[PDB]
């Protein structure tokens, strides 16, 4: 678990998040290593809409063992600001994360910061409708990472949905 002296940075929230995109199968195409360790490699999730929320069934390989987690996600306050409550089971755990960037079509970048040792740990992940980022979505992703008051594009690990077992 990697810690960075100081409080979590202040983050500019998105203003156009669209909950309607999240159904079907989304692939976790990249993440920070602390996230891949904690919540697994080879990650993907099937989202099922249920009113103003989504049911999440998420597959990953965690400490070398396959797991399914059953979980939910919900908006927190105005849905457009991309503040997202999620639960995942287990042992059910819950929390809140925020959306750093999306094109409301192909990809979403999620972020969680967590601050008493003098510091914070950041977790970043990227989901996409396609197993691999190609082009348009990839370009969008490429640019957002640079002006990030918080994402270190060098620290991301891109998934390889190949070997995975």
UniProtKB/Swiss-Prot annotation:
Hemolymph. It is found in: Secreted. InterPro entries: Calycin (IPR012674), Invtbrt_color (IPR003057), Lipocalin_ApoD (IPR022271), Lipocalin_CS (IPR022272), Lipocln_cytosolic_FA-bd_dom (IPR000566). The keyword Transcription does not apply. One of its GO terms (cellular component) is extracellular region. Keywords: Bile pigment, Chromophore, Disulfide bond, Pigment, Secreted, Signal. GO terms for biological process: lipid metabolic process; response to reactive oxygen species. It comes from the Eukaryota. Homotetramer. This protein binds the blue pigments bilins. This is Bilin-binding protein. It comes from Pieris brassicae (White butterfly).
